[PDB]
Paper text:
We refined three models of LdtMt2Δ130: (i) the apo form, (ii) a mercury-derivatized ligand-free form and (iii) a meropenem-complexed form. The apo and mercury-derivatized crystals contained one monomer of LdtMt2Δ130 per asymmetric unit, whereas the crystals of the meropenem complex contained two monomers (chains A and B) in the asymmetric unit. In these models, the N-­terminal residues (Leu131–Ala149 in the apo form, Leu131–Thr145 in the mercury derivative and Leu131–Gln140 in the meropenem complex for both chains A and B) and C-terminal affinity tag (LEHHHHHH) are disordered. In the apo model, the internal region of the polypeptide chain (Ser305–Tyr318) is also disordered. The flexible nature of the active-site lid is further supported by the apo structure, in which much of the lid is disordered. Our crystals of apo LdtMt2Δ130 were obtained using a reservoir solution containing 50 mM calcium chloride, whereas the crystallization condition for the meropenem complex did not contain calcium ions. The r.m.s. deviation between the apo and mercury-derivative models is small (0.40 Å for 246 Cα-atom pairs), indicating that the mercury binding did not cause a large overall structural change. The largest surface area buried at the interface between two monomers of LdtMt2Δ130 within the crystals is 501 and 815 Å2 per monomer (4.5% and 6.6% of the monomer surface area) for the apo form and the mercury derivative (both in space group C2), respectively. Such monomer–monomer contacts can be regarded as crystallization artifacts. The weighted r.m.s. errors for the monomer (1×) and dimer (2×) fits are 7.93 × 10−3 and 4.88 × 10−2, respectively, demonstrating the superiority of the 1× model. The residual plots shown in Supplementary Fig. S3(b) also support our conclusion that apo LdtMt2Δ130 exists as monomers in solution.
Author numbering: 150 to 304, 319 to 408
The structure:
Amino acid sequence: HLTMPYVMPGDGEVVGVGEPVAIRFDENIADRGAAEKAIKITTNPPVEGAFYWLNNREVRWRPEHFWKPGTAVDVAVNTYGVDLGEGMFGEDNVQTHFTIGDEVIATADDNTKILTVRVNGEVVKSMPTSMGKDSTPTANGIYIVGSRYKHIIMDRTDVDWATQISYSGVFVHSAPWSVGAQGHTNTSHGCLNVSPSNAQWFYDHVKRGDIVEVVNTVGGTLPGIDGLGDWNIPWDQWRAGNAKA
Ligand SMILES: [Ca+2]
């Protein structure tokens, strides 16, 4: 009858301008309103933001637009002993403080099959890419950079320099097998294939909460409730929330 909250990002982290605050509970939350009320987010410079649930256990908070670099965020999850519905009570409080770093937005345009990395509005890197085949396309939309792996076995394929950008399993990563197609032809299951050198560059130069935007593919749009797809939910839907849904 107790539920523990877990907050991301980590205390003292510097994250990108797309990073939502995430409060994840280890049990389903029946009274989302109570949970939201128990979570106090302070921003400096102050910016309006709102809660939206990605699933029964995890709520996100973010502003209407990407964060401003330098913004400091304090999160107080004051859930200890709070009634969260159906006889479940918050086990404890948790807190985090984090800050926003540089604006890093990488745009993959299916028209050019180039991923262009912009840091604070400035092009710093361009890399040929091979995106999802027509039958398995990469969805368009805004993706948030999540975890990274120097090496990972995808699921069985060994992969180097893998930067995760969706929970659905889209990564930017080393793809030595499609170097010839990069910049020319889509060959993947959905991942953004780039050269070993470019994948290592990307891995080294991004951080959690940086943004990848995919445009002009034959896919649809990445689901807002993917896990890293938050920004695809239009603000008016996000702000309205789903506490009573
Ligand atoms: Ca109850």
